[model samples]
Target: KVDLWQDATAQAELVRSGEISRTELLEATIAHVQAVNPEINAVIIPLFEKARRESELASGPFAGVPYLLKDLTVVSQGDINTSSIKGMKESGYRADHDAYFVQRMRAAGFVLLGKTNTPEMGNQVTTEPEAWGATRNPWNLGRSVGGSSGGSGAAVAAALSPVAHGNDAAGSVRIPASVCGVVGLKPTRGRISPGPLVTDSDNVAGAAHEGLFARSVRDIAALLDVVSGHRPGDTFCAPTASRPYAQGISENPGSLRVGVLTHNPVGDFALDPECAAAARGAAAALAALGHDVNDAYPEALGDRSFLKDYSTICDVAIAREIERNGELIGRPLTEDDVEWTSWEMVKRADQVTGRAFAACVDELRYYAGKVERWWEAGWDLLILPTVTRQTPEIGELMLAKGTDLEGRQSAFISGSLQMLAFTVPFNVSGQPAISLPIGMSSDGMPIGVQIVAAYGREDLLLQVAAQLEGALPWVARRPQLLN
Candidate 1:
């Protein structure tokens, strides 16, 4: 029997060894997806026929392996690229050319299964989009799957897809990974290009990096090798690694100083006990593995001003995206075309003065330097919870519709800021961070413990991740729904 729980790398090996034909592998995957996707709603756009056609001729390291793309900024030629906007769906917009990462994924022999669901333009930490509805967490039906990579995270965790594409601007990737029990890595900013269309530095500041979700650390390592690189015209490009990340993980990451941070950086809300316990547990595990671990964190992390600066950049980016989509579909998007929260971002951006926006970006750059100094001062990694709290029930983070607009907006903003507290800082700092499913909540939900490394140090993150995976095995910890 083809085990549905095997990671993509292992699944690909079965095909490479001729134990199963590529066509057979895809059929098995399709059967599994058909079985579970109704309950999970992780896959928003089905591409079974396209996947069948590709399997016949696909070739590469992961030939015959199934994959998913988040239905957000990244696009594949001739495929529907709606970024969970009702207007875009109505316009039936399709890209004429593949994104650079999509092209590389195709070359790597992975068959595109379908596009996963995302929130409107991937603007939230939870994946409750008005366009496609909510993607329920497989671990617990009433809980959130976490977004804007929620669909990707839920899909991989439930075995609907072995691997999936996701991007991180503010904890989008890691939040889902944490909540859904999967491996999600946000590569160093500029490590993956958003080019052929986006080339501006300011845009890079908000969009950040593309990443992947997988069941195993090895799958992430291999997939990163397959799709990460600089494209011409990109304003920022990460330095090429001296070795393949897959290879790097097999080598021992020597005993090193590691920091543990559990305080809610933004101070907008109290950190959940479970979330703090998860990080503390991981720290103890690292200590057991013979690494030095302590309560030390970067002093700059206590600054309450960081979120305001980051939001300035994100607000501008959101407004630009709204404008770009309007141009793409050859019509102006009215307030009804987008979610209220996203529309509010456009209004907020309009009020931001050019001088204030420029100053905001400058402040973030300087703040990032202060954050990176702790890593420079001999800390090899920092371990923390991927989210401020454990998985929230559906609609918990959403605003009450009947409430007054300003009060509703303020409440929602505060909730989201806290949700992104731990994850967003690294995006601004341009460092690599990985979320591993190492902790479990009291109510049986999976918890993610994040390990962050210096800028351009994905190899180190993967090495430590591999070690942790072995020491604290999570592969057998499948969602209860699967059993």
Candidate 2:
């Protein structure tokens, strides 16, 4: 049998070489998930029979390798319900059909093993929503595995599956990946379709993108090649890649002009020493690779006002949901109904004014233009720490009981500032960005270095990531919890 934790690239090579059959790969993956999932509570449900059937099929790039879909985004046809609440067990709400992206994943040869957990509506940075309990960090269960893509990050870090699907609007994918020590790519908006079910372009323009959490850079590129491109009726689509992303890995990216920012852009947060050290180390490594690294932020960058604008837009989306599902208010939503954070967000969103909503959208668009100009000014990539601080303990960001509305908002804004500070700028700019595990924190938690490329330049990011991947080799570094 192949190594359970080897990434998709290694497994694909083995499959191509006839060292492992699709069936054997799937079986091994399923076995791995069964063995360690209980500890992390990452994969909340299983899909063994579907995986077996898919393994028997002869088509797709990941043909036999197992994969898990984050419970929040990219649904599939199965009895597995996406539960984000406490005490709400899986109720067998089979999807009538696979989501468009899931269909693409199937075509690319991924065997769907099951669904991973997330906070209700992916509203929080940590996955401790009352509905889904908590998804612990693979490195240290006492801490959180960042969310709402927390389960995906935890599973990949612990080697439950080599890589799995994750979606980000804000930092859902990147935060957990940072905390869990894996690679999370949040592509440029419209690079991947959120279609065949929901179209959320104008509503959450900067916040949503479907991507993956992978063990290695190549695995991510391979999956991207498979799932990316415009579906029928997409609002906007990224330019087609001139070559396959896997080819990007083999090609050497020439010397680049890289920019580095060390301080958190929001609130008074500062990077934990470990996180800062890791970022500086990554910058040094890039310099060694012949890139010019400079300590500077783009002009007008590090603006905290963007966070307020982002929050307003995000709250507006929540308001839409509350308005649409008014009947569900005051009722206990199904575990799958809504996350606690999202419920509160929805309630708060209903309080925003039309003038305020209009202003937020205009400010975001204006900022997007400014960032676009910055990207065009010859910077190949901008690097920083994915999170300002190391992973926080569980329940640290939850609303305290008996707090008034102002107090609750103040608490959430403060805690979430670090979580969104660095990552949300890219979302607002619609630039493609990624998180790569470069080193560990002083406390032994993983430290992720964030990298952003110009819009439609994921190939460049992948090429740089591959170069770093060779030098830093993280796929084999399983979390201590697994050991």
Candidate 3:
């Protein structure tokens, strides 16, 4: 009995050993997805034809392993890039060419099963996209899966796929990872190229990163080895790792200084007790593993002013995305072209002066240095709760279409800011961070703790994460809903 819940590497090994054929593997996964995806609503576009076609030709190290793509940012050839936006979905905008990132995945032997759901324009941290509806958390059907990678997160956690692609701008990947109880990495800026389609100029202030969600750290390592590198036209590339991440996982990260920050660094909100406990729990686990742990964090984290700049950058970026979608549909966008949140983003973005936008970028560059200095000052890693609170229920955090755009947008922004606080600083700092399922909430929901490392230090991140994975095993902890 082959366990469909096995990580990508294990499934690949089985195929390589001839214990299972690629076609057989694909068929079994399709069966599971068909059975499970209805409950989660994670997969928005089923690519069974593509998967079948690829399964026959798959011959790489990870041949025959099914994968899912978040329906945002990166695009696969012949598939629609809905971005979970109504306009894109209605217009059926298609990608004529594969993103360099997607090309890399095909070369590495991941069969594309489907595109997963995401919030409209990937603007929210929760996966309640009006385009495809909410992707329910497998851990609790009523709760959110967390976006913009929420669909990918839900699919991976529920065993629909061993791995899935997720991009993080501000905690999109890690937020879903935390709420969905899976492993997620927001790799260092430029660690994985945003692509031939999305150059450095297209990246939102160097904070956007492409990565994968997986059930195991080893899978993360292997996928990183396949996808991490400089692509043509990428102006900024992360410094290459010393060794392959797969090899680094078994290597000891050694006893190192680890910092813990359990409270809200921005001070706008209070950290939930369970979420705080998750961070403290990870610190304790690290300490028990012989690492030096403390309640230390970068003082730069408290500067609330950076929030203005971050918001400015994101607002402008999403506004550009809305305009691009308009171009894809061959016309200028009206207010009805996008949801209230995205349309409001465009209105807000219009208010941003070019001077103010450039100034914010410069200020962010300076702020990044201040925050990264904490790592440069000899801290090996920083541990924190991946979210400010427990997983919110579906509709609890969406930027719903409504009457008052300001009131609706304001509430959505507040919830997003709170959910993304601990995770976004690292995105701004251009550091690599991973969320591990380290703790659980009192209500039986999963709680994740983040481990951040210096820029381009994914080797250390994977090494330390693998250690914690062993110390507190979560792979066997499937959602009760699945059972």
Candidate 4:
């Protein structure tokens, strides 16, 4: 009786009414995942044992919903875990306790089937981790699934799960969603706790925040309600929504002001033709639905040329993330322990002096002000291409084997900075945004159109997204996943 294609809310309702049992849901999930996941490499660590135990205990508003987690960062006690670092994976590390987000998801009855793949230390936007191998796109087998949350992105897109865990620091969530053709929302910073350790800012530790992927807009809101709310010892919490997020999406968002930018008008590169067409298509859709849409993107936010500074900031941060791995593995890293990109950066922390670090921080603040000021000035939403191009082949961004590590790190920074062109602005601005599958490429790949809301206004993003969902109806356009 389970409908794998239904939104998570509908799946939960089916379980609730006994139209389907939790056992029925899991069987279908595991069956479909077994049939599909081997090809995509989405769920790298299947938790089938406890999944059976927990799905049987489904309760709360989303009783018996099948779930998956990005197999990195956040932890669940006693679960097979790795922060996607090879040394930690080699050490066979497991989390000592559940992260607050995990506790919240379990409370809402979303059973964990297993965790999906991710880039090591989530250091890159592509999920070709040296620890786990590449997670191929479900849509076109040769393409990317997008990481640090790539596996989670590919999971839902391939219909392996209705929703899966993800997080964003710089376009990790939305990039994957856009590439995979699913809904990926990085909720307002702090909407979901990064506790009892990860927080509002992780320094070069990463300004990471948690989120999820879903097929529908209401599914996004429903998942948000389940995992959100501040926990004890929290350093940051998002402002409260006026209504329950899921319940609010069905209502009209009124004739809101919308700003649309089809290109990276301020960046050094232009948006790809496919993505530009997609963004323009989304603008038209919003206009038809009664919103005032125009090409009024904020110009003061500047370009990817400024990314070299933040590049230094993150490269410096990478040294410590690797250091944490060494601390747990009971030894310091050698050349064999980390990827060359990380190894290359590990030596350069001293390069980002206080002056250079401060300059990057100041620029982020300046950019944040310009982006926020546009929203605060009465624009209800800003729509743009989720990424500059459609997903490339799996190894397009992966460094070549035996290639000289000396110069590869520079290529890594340059390639990855272009990735942040559209999506990372919201991450630094601490605003909420969703990547909706509103268009496709000429080659039939998904091109996600991003809808950004003001701080604490995920409700508006969802409302508009739900309306667009009904209009676009991407559900029936499922990927042709080959056996």
Candidate 5:
């Protein structure tokens, strides 16, 4: 028998050492999903027979261990595909081939268990898509598990699968990871290929990247070693690390110069006291590990309008998707087909003149340049609260009566905005960032600390994250559902 709640790193080691076969782990994972998924709706589709067949093959590092992919990106051949929307619910459009990252995952011996839930088009930070209902946090059933990767967050947090894949455009990975108390890393863009299905799904600037949600830093590092690299026809690629990321974890990140910020430049929300305390606690842990922690903000943190340009870029990206897939959309997307908030933003993008779009791009490029300069100015890593406050109660931001399109949009945007306060700046800057669960809130919910590195400097970020992992060690803290 296998323990579903065991850390993925440990489980992988057990399989590699012949302590357990892949079939055993896969069965355990399936049992876990079957047991808990009804409560959280974390997994939208299951692939048990395929997983069993794959488990019989020769082993890799995680051979036979179960995993999931978020439904938005990364096509799963012969599996049901839904962007978590009813419009595309027809299962006829099967993927003929696996995504690039899926090939890497298959090679590593992970059994593909199912597809996790995601927002429609992954256009928003909440998972309550008009198509798929909300994914509830495992830590507290009445609270949300952040989005657009909320399903992966909730699944991993609930231990439905040991680890799951997630993608990040603007804090999709980090925000959900923070809310659900899992380890998430948005590796440098281009580090992992977007292929077989997507030539380039990112906005013209390319801020999007594929990442993972894991229970431990070591598992994340191990997965990165197996998956990070260039795909055959990629437009751009990140340089290979001098050493494997898995090896980087064992190396000491000596006396790193850390900068901390507790305020959101884009919103009026200050970091919640508990969240700030959690961040401060992480800073203290770093200090104890011999790193120099300073009360300062990154120079690039001064960008006040970062979210405006980010929102515009996101809207423009969605508009492009509508252009390509409009015909395939199940129902005609009038102003009412999508979430009111997303509709308004997409409408705004439709209204943007070519000149305005170009101006936003130029502004984004200028800000990216400024962030690069800041990174060069002696900062090893920047730290902050993962979310502005502790996770909100379930349905706090859900659409309600008397909520007009504009009011609905404002409430939804404002509620989701709090979680992105610290995470989005790095997305716009195209930096590598990680969210680690470092402490718990007064209400017993987990609190995460966000750490960001300069673009293409994931090596440093991983090193620091490994150090914190050793100090805090959250791998054993399974949610009540898992217990």
Candidate 6:
């Protein structure tokens, strides 16, 4: 009997030892996906044949392991790479190549089960995209799975996939991890190239990064070793690692200073007490593990304008994306071509002055320099709540309300800003952060504690994460959604 809940690393070992054939895993995986995906809306596209065929021929460290390609970033050849964009789907868009990261995953022997759902262009913190509908949280069907990596979050949490691809610009990966009660690692900027096409590209003040969602700290560390490195012509390469990331987690990381932050940084929203509690609880755990834990956070975190400016950069990025798609298909993209909210964002970017955009980028760089000093001052990790509030209901953070436009827009913006309060600051600084399931909320939904490390210090983060995982085991904690 195979254990579906085992993390990817353990499953890979079983395959390597010939305890179970690749065919058996694929059969079980496909059957399980079919069983519950309709209820969860986690997997939007099913590439059953592609997955089965590839698993047989695949050979790597994780050969035959089930995996999901996030619908947003990768252009998996022959698979629909629609980032849940209805227009892209209608335009019959087919990607001719894979993103550099996807190519690495393929080489590592993971089977591409299918594309998980994402919000249109990954704009919102929740995953209820008009393109694929809402992905239910397995922990609580009524609550959010967190996005724009929501589908991946839901699918992995529900045992539909053990590991999945997720990209983080402003907490996409960690947000979902926190809400879904899993491990999400956002590698340092340039650790995984957003490339093949987007090369020479720095997305949003170099804030955008690529990483993964996993079932355990070890899984994340091992996958990091496999996927994180510079490819030729990468626009930027992360600082070369002191050692392989997996090596970092193999033993006790030794004691270090930790900064604990629990306040809501965004003025527009109030932090949920339970959410803040998660961070303090994690701080206690670190202290119990012999690390120095303090109630200190970076001084720069007091400012709230970073969200506004960084959001502008995202809007501009989306606008260019819309324009690029229009040029490719020879048709001007419209509101109907994308979700209503994404279209509205495109319009906002159109109004941004060139000088104004430059100022926004400069703001990000300046604040990043200021915030990076906290880690440089000898703090090894910073722990906080990953979300501003507990996971929301399906339509709670969406922009697709048929209500009055301005009201809908304002509510969405305010909500997004609040929810991203803890996550985006690290994005701006290009630091490595991981969200680990630390506890359950009063409402019975999962909440996560975030651990952030200095730039290029994912090894340290993983070490501490492994220690935490041992102290607080979360692998057996599953949602009753399937039952």
| Alpha-carbon RMSD, each predicted model | 1.9, 2.9, 1.7, 2.2, 2.4, 2.0
lDDT of 4 by residue, 267-339 (tens): 5666788888888888898899888988887665555444555566677667777776687667987668777
Give the Å shift of residue 192 in candidate 4: 1.2
Question: How close is every model to the real structure, measured as TM-score?
Answer: 0.96, 0.92, 0.97, 0.94, 0.93, 0.95
TM-score, ranked from best to worst: 3, 1, 6, 4, 5, 2
Global CA lDDT of candidate 2, please?
0.76
lDDT of 3 by residue, 203-284 (tens): 7878788877998999999988888888887756888877888987899878999999988776878999999988898889
TM-score of 2: 0.92
List runs of model 3 lying over 4 Å from the truth: 199-201, 399-412
- Those runs of model 5 whose alpha carbons end farther than 4 Å from true positions after fitting are 90-92, 199-204, 265-267, 327-337, 400-412
Candidate 2 — which residues are off by over 4 angstroms?
A: 83-92, 199-203, 265-267, 322-340, 353-355, 404-412
Residue 308, model 5, lDDT: 69
Model 3 TM-score relative to the real fold: 0.97
What is the C-alpha local distance difference test score of each model? 0.85, 0.76, 0.85, 0.80, 0.77, 0.82
Q: Candidate 1 — what's its lDDT?
A: 0.85
Per-residue lDDT of candidate 5, residues 62-93 (tens digit): 88788889987688887777676454664244
Question: Which window of 10 residues has the lowest lDDT sum in candidate 6?
Answer: 403-412
Compared with the true structure, model 5 gives a TM-score of 0.93
What is the per-residue lDDT of model 1 for residues 1-483, given as tens digits with 9 covering 90 to 100?
478798998899999999888888899889989989999899999899889988887899998888999887778889887899888888889878888888888889999999999988887888888888899999998999988899999999999889999988878899899999999999987887765777213554744678889989999999989888877876667767899988888988799799998877557688888989988988888899999988888888787576677776777777788888888989889888888877877888888898987898888888889999999999999999888876878887766544444412222365666667888788778889999999899999999999999888898899989988988898878887897
How much is the lDDT of residue 45 in candidate 2?
74
Count of residue pairs whose backbone atoms collide, per candidate: 0, 6, 0, 1, 1, 0
Clashing pairs in 2: 61-108, 62-109, 85-131, 86-131, 120-339, 169-207
By lDDT, rank the candidates, best first: 3, 1, 6, 4, 5, 2
